[PDB]
A paper describes a structure:
Compared to the WT, the nat_mutants [name] and P80R appeared to form more distinct complex bands with SL4ext in the EMSAs. Interestingly, in contrast to the other nat_mutants, NMR-derived CSD plots for both mutants revealed more significant changes in comparison to the WT, suggesting a more far-reaching modulation of their fold or plasticity toward complex formation with RNA. We further investigated the RNA-binding of [name] and P80R, located in the N-loop and counter finger, respectively, by NMR spectroscopy. We were able to solve the 1.7 Å and 1.9 Å crystal structures for [name] and P80R, respectively. Surprisingly, both mutant structures superimposed with WT similarly well as the other nat_mutants, with RMSD values of 0.668 Å ([name]) and 0.898 Å (P80R), respectively. Although the overall differences between the mutant and WT structures were insignificant, a closer look at the site of mutation at position 63 revealed the loss of salt-bridge/H-bond interactions between residues G63 and R89 in our [name] structure. These subtle changes in intramolecular interactions possibly alter the flexibility of R89 sidechain and may lead to modulated RNA-binding properties of [name]. In line with the retained backbone at this position in the crystal structures, {1H}15N heteronuclear steady-state NOE (hetNOE) values of backbone amides in the [name] mutant do not differ significantly from WT around the site of mutation. From those, only P80R and [name] exhibit slightly increased affinity for RNA, which likely correlates with an increased positive surface charge that possibly supports RNA engagement. On the protein level, mutations [name] and P80R also impact the gene product of the overlapping shifted open reading frame ORF9b47,48, where they result in T60A and Q77E, respectively.
Residue numbers in the entry: 50 to 171
The structure:
Amino acid sequence: ASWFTALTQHGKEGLKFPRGQGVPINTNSSPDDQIGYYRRATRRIRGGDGKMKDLSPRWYFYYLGTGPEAGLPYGANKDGIIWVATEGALNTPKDHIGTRNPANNAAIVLQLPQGTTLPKGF
């Protein structure tokens, strides 16, 4: 499980951030730790007609070296994965932060610093 709540893509543009932006605020992490990826999670449902459809994609953040793409190095090219890093982060895996157990931690509400650029529809 991600440490954070998702970003929902209500529009047609997939997620991306300008370099330096996009890492969720987490006061239980340090400057070196501010680096990772969002991963798209799509869900299907039965619509009100007889028919399966996609819900709006969700994008969940994971620290570098953790989560479903724990094996990927920063910048690796993969569909549904985008990368973010705050100025000064170390490009090292964040096993010390890891992923969340919902049994014993709520998700942290995803917040970005004042004035982050967001694609249309986030």
